[PDB]
Design a protein around this ligand. Sequence first.
Ligand SMILES: O=C(O)[C@@H]1[C@H](C(=O)O)[C@H]2CC[C@@H]1O2
Ligand SMILES: [Mn+2]
Ligand SMILES: [Mn+2]
Length: 309
Amino acid sequence: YSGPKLEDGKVTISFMKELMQWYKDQKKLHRKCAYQILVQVKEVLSKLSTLVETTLKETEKITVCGDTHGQFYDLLNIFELNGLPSETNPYIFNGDFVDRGSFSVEVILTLFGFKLLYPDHFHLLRGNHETDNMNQIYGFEGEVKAKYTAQMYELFSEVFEWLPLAQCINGKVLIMHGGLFSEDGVTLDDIRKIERNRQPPDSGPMCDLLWSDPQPQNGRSISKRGVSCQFGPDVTKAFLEENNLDYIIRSHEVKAEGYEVAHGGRCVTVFSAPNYCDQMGNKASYIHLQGSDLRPQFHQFTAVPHPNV
Ligand SMILES: O=C(O)[C@@H]1[C@H](C(=O)O)[C@H]2CC[C@@H]1O2
Ligand SMILES: [Mn+2]
Ligand SMILES: [Mn+2]
C-alpha cells in the first residue's frame, strides 16, 4: 500500500492533495485511513448546532454548492474552477453528496477530509440522501459494501446523523437542502432545537428541511414526492419576515441552468451535479456571497469526463 497516509493520525493539506489524485486514478483509500476520518469527523460534527450560524465580515466570501451525487470528477472540477477550500476560500455543500453517481465514496471522504482540515470554513449540510432509507435504494450502501464492508457503511450512516440541517449567514441568508415548512410559525430557534441525530421522521420540521420544494402559486400543496410539501411565495415571505431574513438558498432539484431564483428573489435553488446521472444534460452552478453584499452571484459550469463506470 503506497496510498495516502494521515500524518500523525490527522488530515493535512498534502494528504488531501494525495487523496484527490489517488481517487482521480480510481484507487481506494485504505480502510484504516477511511475509518479515522469517519470517527474524527463524527466528533467534529456532533459538536455543531443543528443550525450553524456563520458571520461573514465585509471582506470575506463563501461559496455555496448544491447536490453533488457522487460525481467526484465534477467535484474536482469545482475545486479547479473555484480553488481548493481554505480559511480564505470557504465552502458550504448543501446536502446530497452521495447516491446516484458512481463515485459517492470518493466524494464523501474528500468532503469529510476537508471538514477535518478546515472545520470553521468548510461546511456540510444534510440532504435527503444522507439517510439509511435512501442509501439502501439509490446506490451508496451498495458502493460502500463493495469497496469496504457493511460495518463501514454503518459508520457512514452514524456520521450522517450528525450533519447540521441548516446554516444561517449574517442572520440574513438561510441555507438548507430542501426548503421551508409544512406549517407556519417555524423560527430559527426551533431549527436550532431540532434533535437531529437520527433518521428523519416522516413529517415535521426535520423532514421539511430535507424534502420540501417551492411552488410558484400561493399556498401549500401535498408533495408529489410522497413526503413534506410544496410551499408558495406567501410561505417564504412570512417565514423571512418573522425571522428577519433576506432569502433562503436551497438545492434538491435539478435545474437546466444549474440554478433558479423563485418567489421574486426570495427562494434560490443551486444544483451542483452537471449532466446529472450522465443523462439530464443540465448545467450546474455554485454561488458566491460576500459579507458586504449577500446577493447571490451564480457561477455556471458543465460536466467533465469521468471513468466509465
Ligand atoms: O434531491 C433530490 O431529491 C433530487 C434528486 C435526488 O437527490 O434524488 C436529484 C435530482 C434532482 C434532485 O437531486
Ligand atoms: Mn435532495
Ligand atoms: Mn439530490
